[PDB]
Write a protein that binds this DNA or RNA. Structure first.
Lengths: 253, 19, 254, 256, 20
DNA sequence: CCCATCGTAT
DNA sequence: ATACGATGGG
């Protein structure tokens, strides 16, 4: 398996997003590309990364490998990589090893790191096809700020999806707080827009702890898509360029 | 951000998904 | 009733950073004339007096005179939510234990509104008088900020000596001794960067650097500070707030 | 009577003392007509540092006899941190006080700090430094070298510098895995300043503790270039030059 | 981010190389 | 060269 | 749980 990524800063961004939520996880390499799917320490939330081979330069995969990586380990190694560096994954089928090679732009420095793989009992989970009562698309940043701000009011947030806009509310010791995101009538902020596909109205409750973890992915995308129905796991999705996506799953009240 | 806890009333993702 | 619409919301935010390390809870005094606040520090060492004149707000309406008991640490955490470019509005009803802070972003798109629980505070408002002052230094807020930080590393008290020529600040301890001499500005094109002295009598007072360093958390409100001093009398550090009012600290010399 | 040394570019005195303070608690400055010298071992007696600021580099330099000032560098650092980076710093001492005066004139010309620090009595001991030919001598960007030592500090606790004709390689290992950084020699690109140059006589493959290298790199602000200089079982010399004023040289013994 | 790694057992001091 | 973000120690 | 210094961006 060999995979040359021009924009190396992605593999770096990905691993910051994940490492607060997952210690160790199984990368599933195939001709089609790189997939990953894990639950959190606490078995509360679920993350699924999907990076399609189309998005790499060199992509070659002979057999389907299932590499057990320690994400905290792999992050510390990836933090070495320059953000403008051309990153390449190489792994030799046999061996408990994954090679990350980093070429800098001057073409005159080249790092290469070998990290020790793990054997992982990957409890394979099966994420159903669902239609969704509501689906907000909004700026990753905006959503990030809301979750940070309301984390100061209380420990749960109440997302109310409606025809004309979305509301987020939280309460506690200090008081109460309501944040009302109206819909963008298109052609403004430039992309910095809020769009809604509301079939059935919803008011769901979620713990802000986990939302605030999921938002660590914010660097990957200027847009986040929240997708909801009564007592069915909310799906926070960050799309990765033209290459894949990252999806979080959290069960509501 | 203020350090949060996980509500007692949280369900596991196990009760929604499986193999 | 009371509603007060502030276009430049970053001021209400700056105010509350300046206060929150010095005062836990305090009584806001709302009136037709505007917003006044006056508290001592937890430790009964210093006093702060905030004055925001109604003229400085956009909308200001205040029926009768309310005395709102706010927890400043609480109100800060809520104001930290507000974007710095956001249009902040205070609303509070008569007979009521709550103050509403509404924050509209510039995009016109996002709007926060927070409700905080008020408390009952008896506070026997001091009464500060006009006083004449042996010395009055007017200098850059930054300069003064730096001096207090630097000397805080030498020890825990600073010695402000006012003279005709200039002002001097000295402190001593473990490391050694340090003297910082601010001469008066000869040219001074700009206020931002000038040192001015109004010396009547010479003075040498001693103050705790702990409190000075608190007072300097107000530095964002003004490019200028004014220190004002007399032989047996609380120093007054004063930060003026753009078209709105001022913030004044009072510290009694050691 | 008196020593006085007026440095227009004050940020140097500041930079020097950041470079030294993680390595040395207390040391004897050797002040003389010729200039300011310092030569100390570290707390643990592992490495050696030799600072040399030549009088020609100061604006005012006057030294009436030789002083040997015992300074507490922790103290002197905290005092120098007060000085603005654009400040005109002046070091002044009489033969008849136990004290060193650091006076700071800000660039605005209306503010002036002056600090008085107490000197100390230091039973020193000055090491003899022998003339030495060097199997290898890398000259590279201070930054590059800084990054390498930081990065590999995350792999483990020693780094293996292999010098060859073609280029230099740095390798380290530990719990997580293994790590190799190959720095090939520069033909050019922009223009000196950001080049890798090698003076290889004999190939060398030496092992060094990353703890100490990472201390030495705290000097990086003084120079855009560093020079590593190496031989079988002979202390490595990391050297930062200080703008036609002097230099700073660290000495660390390799694995044997 | 910089790791301050302990001082290797195999470290020699500069004392054994230079003297008064 | 000043302002904005990060990380630990009390 | 809150303060105060350390690091990086513009």
């Amino acid at each position: 398996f060999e995979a040359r990524l021009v924009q190396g800063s992605i593999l770096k961004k990905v691993l910051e997003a994940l490492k607060d939520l997952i210690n160790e996880a199984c990368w599933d390499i195939s001709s089609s590309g790189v997939n990953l799917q894990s639950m959190d320490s606490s078995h509360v939330s679920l993350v699924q990364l999907t990076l399609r081979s189309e998005g790499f330069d060199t992509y070659r995969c002979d057999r389907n490998l299932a590499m057990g990586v320690n994400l905290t380990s792999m992050s510390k190694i990836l933090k070495c990589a320059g953000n403008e560096d051309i990153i390449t994954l190489r792994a030799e089928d046999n061996a408990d090893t994954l090679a990350l090679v980093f070429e800098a732009p001057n073409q005159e420095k080249v790092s290469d790191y070998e990290m020790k793989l793990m054997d992982l009992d990957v409890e394979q989970l099966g994420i159903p096809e669902q239609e969704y009562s509501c689906v907000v698309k909004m700026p990753s940043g905006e959503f990030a700020r809301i979750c940070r701000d309301l984390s100061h009011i209380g420990d749960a947030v109440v997302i109310s999806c409606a025809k004309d806009g979305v509301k987020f509310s939280a309460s506690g010791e200090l008081g109460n707080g309501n944040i009302k995101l109206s819909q963008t009538s298109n052609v403004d902020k430039e992309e910095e827009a809020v769009t809604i596909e509301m079939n059935e109205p919803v008011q769901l409750t979620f713990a802000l702890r986990y939302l605030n973890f999921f938002t660590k992915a914010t660097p990957l995308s200027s847009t986040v898509t929240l997708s909801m129905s009564a007592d069915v796991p909310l799906v926070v999705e960050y799309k990765i360029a033209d290459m894949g996506h990252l999806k979080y799953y959290l069960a509501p009240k | 951000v203020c350090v949060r806890p996980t509500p007692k009333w949280q369900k596991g993702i196990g009760e929604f998904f499986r193999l």
